[PDB]
Design a protein around this ligand. Sequence first.
Ligand SMILES: Cc1ccc(OCC(=O)N2CC[NH+](C)CC2)cc1
Ligand SMILES: Cc1ccc(OCC(=O)N2CC[NH+](C)CC2)cc1
Ligand SMILES: [Cl-]
Ligand SMILES: [Cl-]
Ligand SMILES: [Cl-]
Ligand SMILES: [Cl-]
Length: 342
Amino acid sequence: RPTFYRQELNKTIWEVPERYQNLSPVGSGAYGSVCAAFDTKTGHRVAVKKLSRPFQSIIHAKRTYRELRLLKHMKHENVIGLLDVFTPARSLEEFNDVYLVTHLMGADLNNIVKLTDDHVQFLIYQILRGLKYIHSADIIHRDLKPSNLAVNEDCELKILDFRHTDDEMTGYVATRWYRAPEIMLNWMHYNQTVDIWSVGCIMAELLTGRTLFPGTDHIDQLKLILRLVGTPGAELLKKISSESARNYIQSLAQMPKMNFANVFIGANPLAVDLLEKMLVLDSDKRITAAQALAHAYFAQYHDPDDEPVADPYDQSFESRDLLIDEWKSLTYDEVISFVPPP
Ligand SMILES: Cc1ccc(OCC(=O)N2CC[NH+](C)CC2)cc1
Ligand SMILES: Cc1ccc(OCC(=O)N2CC[NH+](C)CC2)cc1
Ligand SMILES: [Cl-]
Ligand SMILES: [Cl-]
Ligand SMILES: [Cl-]
Ligand SMILES: [Cl-]
């Protein structure tokens, strides 16, 4: 066990191993607080997050366990990984606080977004390489958007930030602009094809410099989507499971899918083709991450021997009913069993 030292930064007590020096606040919120630091053991600049109220309810305790399980599993060049996890507690009985450590990330895609076609190829390639890995473990990201994609000075990219309130999704908000239409109004339960819809929205924005579907509310956004990709046809309508969805969509005048070469004027024809394959209304028919990596748009970067899959991820805990102290003990076990990367 390392020696810990204490300090107060912006009215919060931080107790961390001596290896972490020069802590300085970088943000806070309902989730907790985050500090940048220098890790003297690895020489990396790091982000240290202290969770707030990690075991305040059953929902909160299960969410703390879920985050730690997901971060401990991720081991891929284009996905955030866990450098360390610690608690100052010496026993389960005095266990209360959890701290998570990752590489300190600089810019996100929001800040970067002059993007040439070569830049778009490399950025979207890396997103899809990371998504092939995530999806191979049967993990769904569910919230892909530019602020959740970190990028360094050499255009290298990592996916991060794997529930949002109803108020957070209301109105003219980027928190909703990248969501697939089948989940935006809860017509359907999540499945991994929703992440490919988000990639299409992000890729379009990198090519044009503009949000693809900047709706002022859920209904406005659906109308923007259906104008581009068309109203549902006979084949898809037959498959729609929600009755209130069926009835509302049938109230809209029918519209054909637009010509994407006239929407994305001047773009690489291979980029237009890939966008037509991601932005399909019927989610069954969307291209997958593994299929997209082999599309000719990525000819300069595709290497089928260097696009790895993930170890299996057991999420049977998601359907388990446990008490707060049982979720807390499971979390404690995962803290003390952590093994750092080489
Ligand atoms: C060391 C570390 C580990 C995991 C982290 O997760 C990001 C996070 O907590 N949030 C980012 C997105 N905000 C909406 C809420 C806060 C952050 C730092
Ligand atoms: C056959 C082909 C290959 C790559 C392409 O990328 C777009 C491009 O190079 N442009 C530069 C000139 N701008 C006016 C529009 C964007 C476009 C066509
Ligand atoms: Cl130490
Ligand atoms: Cl990382
Ligand atoms: Cl503690
Ligand atoms: Cl597992």
